[PDB]
């Protein structure tokens, strides 16, 4: 996260770290949506142009973390994966449309003060909260600047949703309604963005109607990090929510 701050303990208890087994590397963020299911970006798991295609045995999911590096005895849980599910229409060639995947844990994770699922939006959440100028929150252990730049602890930044035409005009890539964009406009003081290794983490919003946190987006893509006139693009979770429910119904 660029221009963020240290997250407080327990502030994002659905945050998940995706960690490569061999060689050991921080890969991406993810989010806990139930005791057995984790949501992330498809490109964290599958990216043919770089010969990326992880199997379930290649990765760990680390839940409950704050420190990027210390094994957090007493708090963190490391879970193995039973199965990965990539959206079948994930479009890595053109624009990362449908950049979404689900991971099923081999065993359910015990909730705690540090481990707790985020809500998925319903129809009326999406209607009420996805409006230009409203801010959501992005968290992760990604790099602190476009590229060692690694943070000591989980970072957080709050970013406003941007108008659809401004998102479209900011890039020559064909963007779709399965994504939205967020970030500050140039010359307006505050800035900030997700960056490398924050992909797959959640863009969350707190409802003023019921005070729950809902995951509206997944960190998907951008042109570098925190560039003037560019925005971060996020997978629109509600638009893909039928697929999420279909996978969990069929496999949970």
């Amino acid at each position: 996260i660029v221009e963020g701050s240290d997250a407080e303990i327990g502030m994002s208890p659905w945050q998940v770290m995706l960690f490569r087994k061999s060689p050991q590397e921080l890969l991406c963020g993810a989010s806990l949506i139930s005791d057995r299911w984790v949501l992330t970006a498809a490109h964290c798991l599958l990216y043919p142009p770089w010969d990326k295609n992880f199997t379930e045995n290649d990765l760990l999911v680390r839940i409950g973390k704050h420190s990027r590096t210390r094994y957090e005895r007493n708090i963190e849980k490391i879970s193995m994966l039973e199965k990965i599910y990539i959206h079948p229409r994930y479009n890595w060639r053109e624009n990362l449309d449908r950049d979404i995947a689900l991971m099923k844990l081999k065993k359910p994770v015990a909730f705690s003060d540090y481990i707790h699922p985020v809500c998925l939006p319903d129809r009326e959440t999406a209607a009420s909260l996805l409006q230009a100028g409203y801010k959501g929150r992005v968290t992760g252990w990604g790099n602190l600047k476009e590229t060692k730049g690694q943070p000591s602890v989980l970072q957080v930044v709050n970013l406003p949703i941007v108008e659809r035409p401004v998102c479209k005009d900011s890039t020559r890539i064909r963007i779709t309604d399965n994504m939205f964009c967020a970030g500050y406009k140039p010359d307006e003081g505050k800035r900030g963005d997700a960056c490398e290794g924050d992909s797959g983490g959640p863009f969350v919003m707190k409802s003023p109607f019921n005070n729950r946190w809902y995951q509206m987006g997944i960190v998907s893509w951008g042109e570098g990090c925190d560039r003037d006139g560019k925005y971060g693009f996020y997978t629109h979770v509600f638009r893909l929510k039928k697929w999420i429910q279909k996978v969990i119904d069929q496999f949970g």
């Binding site: 050991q24 964290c44 990216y47 760990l60 590096t69 690694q150 290794g197 570098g224």
Partner: peptide, 24 residues
């Protein structure tokens, strides 16, 4: 379960999300 002693300053993997091939 996974033995945590198997783990600390691991690198962050280059992320295609911020360097997608569709821009090159």
């Amino acid at each position: 379960e996974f033995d945590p002693s198997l783990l600390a300053d691991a690198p962050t993997a280059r992320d295609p999300g911020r360097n997608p091939e569709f821009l090159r």
